[PDB]
Design a protein around this ligand. Structure first.
Ligand SMILES: COc1ncc(C2CC2)nc1C(=O)N[C@@H]1CCN(c2ccc(Cl)cn2)C1
Ligand SMILES: [Mg+2]
Ligand SMILES: [Zn+2]
Length: 313
């Protein structure tokens, strides 16, 4: 009960900032996550014995892939922590509980392949889940791990709070499917501008949490340039492997995924920043003004990519 996690002074200060990097020491990531839960939620939210056992079963079920790995889980959970701490009073006790867990679990058992490649490969998961294939699998994996003996971090909730938290986690994980992002943001855009956005409306909250999940998921584009630049390599390592596997199925991959077309990457990042990232953090900033630092960092990085193209790096 009186066992807190503390961090060294540099991490203790930097962890509160949106652009924090969790560092290369894997063995510190669980403590960083429990630190964030204790400050976001309270030292009482979860039995520590059960949280630690849940955290380590989730780590085990992330694979050794270049990008969709344990480091991504904890990175995405940290961005959600930053959003929740910068927007104290807007979120319920259950929402803070659910969303940090949703983020840590959102890519459970990712193999590094898009939903597209699963469908062209004709993977069993594509027969089981026609849309949001991997995301339905990740939520499935979350429930499986919650049901292991000794792993049920929600055991002390009432029946109905338990059903509320699992519903929050399911919608939050489905929202990380970028194919659903475009429509979600366009609706949140219309609703903010026509003045109809209402946070007491559950279906509006659902949409707003969805956009938070997209924002945390893409948070690589909101770090300091040297972190953003080095993560891009990990992101492209998966893309190119997927492109390689498309060629094995006899399908020319889109140039983004073709490792012969590396020249085209800086322009690929422009496209992605303008079409996805900038609009995402814009709408988020309009709805939750204290998340502006994400939009500012994202614009800073757009400009760094513009510099790469102009040959200035
Ligand atoms: C060039 O792509 C990227 N570069 C950097 C990062 C960093 C945030 C990690 N992420 C991506 C990305 O998620 N691209 C994905 C591939 C292209 N994008 C897309 C567009 C429409 C639909 Cl329906 C699906 N996918 C998303
Ligand atoms: Mg995902
Ligand atoms: Zn992710």
């Amino acid at each position: 009960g009186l066992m807190q996690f503390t961090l060294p002074v540099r991490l203790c200060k930097e962890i509160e900032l949106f652009h924090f990097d969790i560092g290369p020491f894997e063995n510190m990531w669980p403590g960083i996550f429990v630190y964030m839960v204790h400050r976001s939620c309270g030292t009482s939210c979860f039995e520590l014995e059960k949280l630690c056992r849940f955290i380590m079963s989730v780590k085990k079920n992330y694979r050794r892939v270049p990008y969709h790995n344990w480091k991504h889980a904890v990175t995405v959970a940290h961005c959600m922590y930053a959003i929740l701490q910068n927007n104290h009073t807007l979120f319920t006790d259950l929402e803070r509980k659910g969303l940090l867990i949703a983020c840590l679990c959102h890519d459970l058992d990712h193999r590094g392949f898009s939903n597209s490649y699963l469908q062209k490969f004709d993977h069993p998961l594509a027969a089981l889940y026609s849309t949001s294939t991997m995301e339905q699998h990740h939520f499935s994996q979350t429930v499986s791990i919650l049901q292991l003996e000794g792993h049920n971090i929600f055991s002390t909730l009432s029946s109905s709070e338990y059903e509320q938290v699992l519903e929050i986690i399911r919608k939050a994980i489905i929202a990380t499917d970028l194919a659903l992002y475009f429509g979600n943001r366009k609706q949140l855009e219309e609703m903010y501008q026509t003045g109809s956005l209402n946070l007491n409306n559950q279906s509006h909250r659902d949409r707003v949490i969805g956009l938070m999940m997209t924002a945390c998921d893409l948070c690589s584009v909101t770090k300091l340039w040297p972190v953003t630049k080095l993560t891009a390599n990990d992101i492209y390592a998966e893309f190119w492997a997927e492109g390689d596997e498309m060629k094995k199925l006899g399908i020319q991959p889109i140039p983004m995924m073709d490792r012969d077309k590396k020249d085209e990457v800086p322009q690929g990042q422009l496209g992605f920043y303008n079409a996805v990232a900038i609009p995402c953090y814009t709408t988020l900033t309009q709805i939750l003004p204290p998340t502006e630092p994400l939009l500012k960092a994202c614009r800073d990085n757009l400009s760094q990519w513009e510099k790469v193209i102009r040959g200035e790096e």
